Amino acid sequence: MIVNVIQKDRLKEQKLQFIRNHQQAFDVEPIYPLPLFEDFVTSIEGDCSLEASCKIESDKLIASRFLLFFEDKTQEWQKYLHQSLTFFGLVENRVGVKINYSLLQQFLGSSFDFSKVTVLSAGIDLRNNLAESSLKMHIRIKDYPEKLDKAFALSDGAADGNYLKDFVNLIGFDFYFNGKSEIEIYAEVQEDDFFKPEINNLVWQHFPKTALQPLKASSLFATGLSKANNNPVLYYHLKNRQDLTNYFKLNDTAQRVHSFYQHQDILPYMWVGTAQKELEKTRIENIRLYYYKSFKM
Ligand SMILES: CC(C)=CCC/C(C)=C/COP(=O)(O)OP(=O)(O)O
Ligand SMILES: [Mg+2]
Known part of the structure; x- marks a missing residue:
């Protein structure tokens, strides 16, 4: 019992330190309402991961971006959904905003099969303009084609063709503080499929050569x-974060973020997000960088 008590206190502080390391590097003052997210992260006592990320727009650095991934092996997805939504309501109460839940509600419908969930994450992208701040949720589904159909319908034309359903597992939800909400569909290709002819025909041939080059360093696209x-955002799951500079031509702001994270006590992999047009340039001006740490008992 005493081992568990010590460990719970240790993991609580480690999670807060990971958040604070990121915030303190990039934002001299924490962006309100970060402490509410910190309270939420604290309240999750099982195994989890945290994402800290930066969104670079030329010299503009957006850094109050965090996600918690529920990773307790009990697979209690409905419990985690309700914990996340409790946090969302707490944000509504403290900030004095009303969130638009309609895209999430329609996606879940009235008979959601939680046994088909493989990933659930919840978090924030906080801004100095309240209206531009958002809460975030991602749900990854497996063998649930009914819900892929619904997500594509909710996309309002964004999720291009029905051939893409083959590639979709993750569904994202953004909830802006002004009551505007968005859905995102993520079409993925796993590393084991990169060299298959079907993938060249359905995917690779519709991209320029520059979009294919970072695949060499990626476990997932x-x-x-x-x-x-x-523009459609291209995502690369780099096996080793050290490879970022070898495959992506970074501007000064992104290099600053890269440099900070090289020697932090974090997970080896990262995600990189950029528009197709940026990879055609001699230097990327618009890029998103996502870093990870796991917290296990
Ligand atoms: C297996 C897959 C498809 C993983 C997706 C990983 C990832 C970095 C998603 C971007 O999240 P977002 O769209 O919520 O971030 P942003 O706030 O940058 O739009
Ligand atoms: Mg997005």
């Missing part, structure tokens, strides 16, 4: 489709 996106 994805494209994020949403009407909130100006």
Whole structure:
């Protein structure tokens, strides 16, 4: 019992330190309402992972971006959904905003099979303009084609064709503080399929050569489709975060983020998100960088 007590206190502080390391590196003052997210993270006592990320827009650095991934092996997905939504309601109460839950509600419908969930995450992207701040949720589903159909319908034309359903597992939800909400569909290709002729025909031939080059360093490729996106966002799951500079031509702001994270006590892998047009340039100006740490008893 005493071992569990010590460990619970240790993991609580480690999670807060990971959040604070990120915040303190990039934002001299924490963006409100970060402490509410910190309270939520604290309240999750089982095994989890945290994502800390930066969104670079030329010299603009957006860094109050965090996600918690529920990773307790009990697979209690409905419990985790309700914990996340409790946090969302707490945000509504403290900040004095009303969130638009309609895309999530329609996706879940009235008979959601939680045994088909493989990933659930919840978090924040906080801004100095309240209206531009958002809460975030992602749900990954497996063998649930009914829900893929619904997500594509909810996309309002963003999720291009029905051939993409073959590639979709993760569904994302953004909930802006102004009551605007968005859905995102992520079409993915796993590393084991990169060299298959079917993938060259359905996927690779519709991309320029520059979009294919980082695949060499990636375990997974994805494209994020949403009407909130100006362009489709290409995502690369780099096996080793040290390979970022070898495959992506970074501007000064992104290099700053890269440099900070090289020697932090974090997981080896990362995600990189960028528009197709950025990879055609001599230097990327718009990029998202996502880093990870796990917390296990
Ligand atoms: C297996 C797959 C498809 C994983 C997706 C990983 C990832 C970095 C998603 C971006 O999340 P987001 O769209 O919520 O972030 P942003 O706030 O940058 O739009
Ligand atoms: Mg997105």
